[PDB]
Design a protein around this ligand. Structure first.
Ligand code: MG
Lengths: 210, 215
């Protein structure tokens, strides 16, 4: 059976946010001892709720588990900035356990921040290797989701591009990098190159000309 | 309670055995579950084992792929994965159960299944150059390309440049890692006063200093 959770949700400090977990075959009961675990930066997992509504030792009182409709729920009362993380639920089926896809919870703990984009052309030294890597750094954006689009001579290119998952900086904003790899010859067959970053509906792009 | 080695480099076809040391409790009085984490399959349950009685329960995609054991003596639980493939590269967690609650989790063991050999990186200065953005502050950088295994360390001007430094996570291009780092300084400081990125790749004993020069 498949277990389903919301993909992402946003809330603010002090508010109540609720997360749900389906069983695909629904009918979530206390026979699934629904479990809730929190994933924070640098793969640190913390068990929050087990046996549907049992808080794990040491866990804050603001977390609580229950059943809502045919689903399992995780409620966070008076959400704290430190609660921004990913949440996974797990449903036990007598002999085995299955994890949901997890939910990324954003808890607005500072003002929205636009990403600072910098596009770097390939180095003269790298080109000597018949390789050309354009580097697009993206820092200080918040919330932590962003979409990167590369254009060459004005048209979209999805081949030879790699963008890292957003990582959390020290000031709690987010950063990410995107790469466009080309051969030096491909590099020379075009003039204009652009890295376009979309964040919360707004688009910022940086460009250069070979 | 739960200490797991942080990483294991394993060649394709080989086998790997990782541990999960317990502390702060009676190892024999709780279950130990094992979970695999990858971006394309999220978290997947592998199986569980009750050290007190030794019985074991596995998932379907892991019964013939893993073997859970536990040392009642050294308060340590183990997982053996066999015939590793690239699809087995992931982070493996152990988690103590009890009364239906997965209360404690280890920090996970990152298993890297790869044939690549120790490779030093190539370091390229990254300057604005072409249609950049003449402003107030200037952002410089350096590309640490094609090394193996992780990690590498980057500092600027031997460390003097500490404010405004960002080192991004590595991307894998075939079976080599690539990452970049940047530093933002006063436009009046550069190209005026020299800026150099210093890269190190311990695994290969490689060290390289590269100056950021106007394109
Ligand atoms: Mg039991």
């Amino acid at each position: 059976a498949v277990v389903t959770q919301e993909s992402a949700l946003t809330t603010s400090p002090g508010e109540t946010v609720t997360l749900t977990c389906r069983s695909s075959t629904g009918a979530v009961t206390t026979s699934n001892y629904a479990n809730w675990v929190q994933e924070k930066p640098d793969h640190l997992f913390t068990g929050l709720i087990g046996g549907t509504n049992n808080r794990a030792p040491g866990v804050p009182a603001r977390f609580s588990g229950s059943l809502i409709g045919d689903k399992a729920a995780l409620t966070i009362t008076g959400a704290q900035t430190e609660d921004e993380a990913i949440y996974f639920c797990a449903l036990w089926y007598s002999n085995h356990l299955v994890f949901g896809g997890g939910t990324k919870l954003t808890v607005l703990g500072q003002p929205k921040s636009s990403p600072s984009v910098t596009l770097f052309p390939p180095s003269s030294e790298e080109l000597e290797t018949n390789k050309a890597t354009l580097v697009c750094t993206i820092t200080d954006f918040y919330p932590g989701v962003v979409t990167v689009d590369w254009k060459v001579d004005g048209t979209p290119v999805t081949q030879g591009m790699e963008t890292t998952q957003p990582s959390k900086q020290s000031n709690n904003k987010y950063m990410a990098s995107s790469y466009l790899t080309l051969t030096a010859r491909a590099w020379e067959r075009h003039s204009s190159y652009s890295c376009q970053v979309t964040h919360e509906g707004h688009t910022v792009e940086k460009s250069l000309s070979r | 309670q739960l200490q797991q080695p942080g990483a294991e480099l394993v060649k394709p076809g080989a086998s790997v055995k990782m541990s999960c040391k317990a502390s702060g409790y009676t190892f024999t009085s709780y279950n130990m579950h094992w979970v695999k984490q990858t971006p394309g399959q999220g978290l997947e349950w592998i199986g569980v084992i009750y050290p007190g009685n030794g019985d074991t329960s596995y998932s379907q995609k892991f019964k013939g792929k893993a073997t859970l054991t536990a040392d009642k003596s050294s308060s340590t639980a183990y997982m053996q994965l066999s015939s590793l493939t690239s699809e087995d590269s992931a982070v493996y967690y152990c988690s103590r159960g009890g009364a239906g609650i997965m209360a404690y989790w280890g920090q996970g063991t990152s298993v890297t299944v790869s044939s690549a050999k120790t490779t030093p990186p190539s370091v390229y200065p990254l300057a604005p150059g072409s249609a950049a953005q003449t402003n107030s502050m200037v952002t410089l950088g350096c590309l640490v390309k094609g090394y193996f295994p992780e990690p590498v360390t980057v500092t600027w001007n031997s460390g003097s440049l500490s404010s405004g430094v960002h080192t991004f996570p590595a991307v894998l291009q075939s079976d080599l890692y690539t990452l970049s780092s940047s530093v933002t300084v006063p436009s009046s400081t550069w190209p005026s006063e020299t800026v150099t990125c210093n890269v190190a790749h311990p695994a290969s004993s490689t060290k390289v200093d590269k100056k950021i020069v106007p394109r």
